[PDB]
Amino acid sequence: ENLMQVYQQARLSNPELRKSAADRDAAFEKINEARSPLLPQLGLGADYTYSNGYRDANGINSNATSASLQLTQSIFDMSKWRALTLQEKAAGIQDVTYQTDQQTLILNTATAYFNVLNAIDVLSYTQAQKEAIYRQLDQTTQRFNVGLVAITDVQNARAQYDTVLANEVTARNNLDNAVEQLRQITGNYYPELAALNVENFKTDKPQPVNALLKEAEKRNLSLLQARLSQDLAREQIRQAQDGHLPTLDLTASTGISDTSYSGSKTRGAAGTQYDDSNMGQNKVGLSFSLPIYQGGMVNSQVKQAQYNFVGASEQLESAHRSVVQTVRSSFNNINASISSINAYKQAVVSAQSSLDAMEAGYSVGTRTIVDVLDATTTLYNAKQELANARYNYLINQLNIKSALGTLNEQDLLALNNALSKPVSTNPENVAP
């Protein structure tokens, strides 16, 4: 299928994208865990304690059965709210990195799909070179069998044929590896893909690097992640102290206790404090705490958070510089690709003219067979380089679009609008 269906199947059945999305969802669900301690904390607890006397408590045995139902609430504690905001920012940066992962998936699938086509083109060109050299071999061998020229031409052309055969084997292996890699990135085996037609291949100049830089700075994913990380560091230093703020808690508890006494000394004439006691008590209360001198722990924590915030800001600046470098490199690479397309078109036309001239000269007799073989290999190398330059230009267009920060399926549709004919990627079928 063409690029659209390949990308759709890749997006629908990719494991790494699924993993990144699951990680983002887990980071999002962490908000509830972060928010849990602010909500009421309710619990139950029962116990049974048996006490035997000793020393001056000789002959004293006690049995206590207790039950309790407790509830605790944090009336004022800024640390919990700061932790909640930290979790919020972490979820935000995870969402951003998920978006970056989506962009990476699109770029990777496009690169692999075009690599398969480039390998097919390379193999076909090498096979055509082998056919041409075989034709030259047959013509020279038949001329020698009739008898016009020595064996040197036959030997040289045979050596060239063998070298071209080795190159063809290498190209076939490379194509097989590329198609298997495409299957791995997609999850399906594709027998044929849409090729690239040269009639409708029209190039377009890119936008000036100024507006490119403006949009990239405003809407890059990596720079947005760096900004979110710096904001997270700022909230971390804000949370860092959490020691100068007094804390306030509210507690409630319904409890029952049944105590029974027994022993040799417990059967005395007192009969007042040595009898079974059944106490029920429901309690409500408030607790106030305030650290005053923590030993310098809070000050050191605040200073460490300040250093961490400085480091995060510096990492953001590094990310911005990297974004500028990426935009400039992508623009320059696009311009180089569009120039090289025309350069290689002119070069291949020139090489064809040169090969025709060398063949005519050999017919006259001024040249030798090594010269025409060199012209042939130069022609086929030029054709191979032109095809590679075309595919590199398309991939580079996608690369600059991605670095701008606004890459989606519309760009893939624009690329796919230039693919018309289907070709099979079967190694045996192409070269029977």
């Binding site: 699924r18 999305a21 699951a22 999002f28 908000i31 998920y98």
Partner: protein
């Protein structure tokens, strides 16, 4: 609170019918249907396979090349129908942002075990068996998992 709101409004295109849901649930139901009956033919097994293993098995049957593999057993690592199956548990699946989950099922027979592995594809509001990884000793025939075993 704080609903996850998964960011995938996709993963659909379901053609045939299927069971309610639950990966372990559908795997257990499939194995129980195969064990209780004796047919195991693909015509009655259409709901439990999604859209691709069904057509792959159909064209393999019409190809008349893998007759032995498709007539002895396509889904078990042996050449004989198992006696009991125990699918690895999974505590449901949150929302829908999850696909291609593999589960290992203990395929227990009389004093024997092979513990094969089967992939799971969501593809909509449902769950469906796929692949079957043939993870066990004395592999039935061909090699690898079923999908690439019958792949041309």
């Amino acid at each position: 609170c704080t609903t996850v709101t998964p960011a995938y409004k996709d993963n659909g295109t379901r053609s045939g019918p299927c069971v309610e849901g639950g990966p372990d649930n559908v795997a257990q139901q499939f194995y129980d249907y195969r064990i209780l009956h004796r047919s195991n033919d693909i015509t009655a097994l259409r709901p439990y396979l999604s859209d691709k293993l069904a057509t792959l098995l159909s064209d393999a049957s019409r190809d008349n090349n893998h007759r032995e593999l498709l007539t002895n057993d396509p889904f078990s690592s042996r050449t004989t129908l198992p006696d009991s199956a125990h699918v690895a548990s999974a505590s449901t699946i949150p929302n829908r942002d999850a696909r291609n989950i593999p589960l290992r099922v203990d395929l227990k027979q009389g004093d024997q075990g092979w513990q094969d592995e089967v992939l799971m594809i969501q593809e909509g509001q449902c769950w469906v068996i796929d692949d079957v990884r043939y993870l066990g000793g004395s592999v039935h025939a061909t090699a690898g998992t079923l999908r690439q075993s019958i792949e041309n």
